[PDB]
Design a protein around this ligand. Structure first.
Ligand SMILES: [Mg+2]
Ligand SMILES: [Mg+2]
Ligand SMILES: [Mg+2]
Ligand SMILES: [Mg+2]
Ligand SMILES: [Mg+2]
Length: 182
RNA sequence: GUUACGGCGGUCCAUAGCGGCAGGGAAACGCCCGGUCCCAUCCCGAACCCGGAAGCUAAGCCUGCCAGCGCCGAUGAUACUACCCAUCCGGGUGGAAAAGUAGGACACCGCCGAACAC
């Protein structure tokens, strides 16, 4: 009785496109998207612990759910990092609100990147999951640019049931990701 | 009773493992569909849990076949050795490896339940 816009498009069009393109023997082999993970690595927090709270608020507004604070598992003197220090914030998106975040990202957030020339199509990890980084948080309309204290980037990974980069690239391409041509 | 069947066990727990090639879906085991309800996430119905049966044997699971990598492994011989001979080195009777070789091996056994036969 409901469906996120991008999910409907996937089930009705993209599945059929992939079956015609790669000619899978079984329908269970059709690649889909499992989860989207958004990670902010505030290494600076190892000294200025106030910074963690900004990264948390930004991710909460961007994704719509409370981040989980990730503690350092390993002391390292060069970074002034002690084990157990809160040094990262992560959000795991699944299901309906993963399809909504993806739709907002592809439609609104990515075209707002300053001097956006598309994403590199070579950022796949060999198993056909895609990761890309952002340097700032201003390209999200859920964050008030009037209120940001400091530019806070993040790493966004889309993980896929694709077995290889070619299949995963085709899926994201059909999903509307703006890839460069090389 | 017989089955490419589902469980629970066992073996001084790999001869049973890892891997490769091919195949299986009757009831089961599964992925799978969906969060109204018990319950759940240091975030996420992914997991755990609950309610379902549209799809699929592609994976898990199951069956057949490969000795490629692991694993098991003699016989004999040697090393070592207890006791006894032996003025220096050695030897006799008894026990006897490790390594290597021949080779074995792609497990085997018990209870219950399916489904079908009688
Ligand atoms: Mg059946
Ligand atoms: Mg689910
Ligand atoms: Mg198969
Ligand atoms: Mg012997
Ligand atoms: Mg031996």
């Amino acid at each position: 009785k409901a469906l996120p816009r991008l999910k409907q498009r996937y089930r009705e069009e993209i599945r059929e496109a992939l079956q015609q393109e790669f000619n899978y023997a079984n329908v269970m082999q059709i690649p889909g998207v499992v989860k989207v993970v958004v990670n902010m690595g505030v290494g600076d927090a190892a000294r200025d612990a106030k910074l963690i709270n900004g990264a948390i608020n930004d991710l909460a507004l961007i994704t719509g759910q409370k981040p989980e604070v990730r503690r350092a598992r390993k002391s390292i003197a060069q970074f002034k990092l002690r084990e157990g220090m809160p040094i990262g914030a992560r959000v795991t998106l699944r299901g309906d609100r993963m399809w909504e975040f993806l739709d907002r990202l592809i439609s609104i957030a990515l075209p707002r990147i300053r001097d956006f020339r598309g994403l590199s199509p070579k950022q796949f990890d060999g198993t056909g999951n895609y990761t890309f980084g952002l340097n700032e948080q201003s390209m999200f309309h859920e964050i008030d640019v009037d209120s940001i204290d400091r530019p806070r980037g993040m790493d966004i990974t889309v993980v896929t049931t694709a077995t290889n980069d070619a299949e995963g690239r085709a899926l994201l391409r059909a999903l509307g990701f703006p890839f460069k041509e090389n």
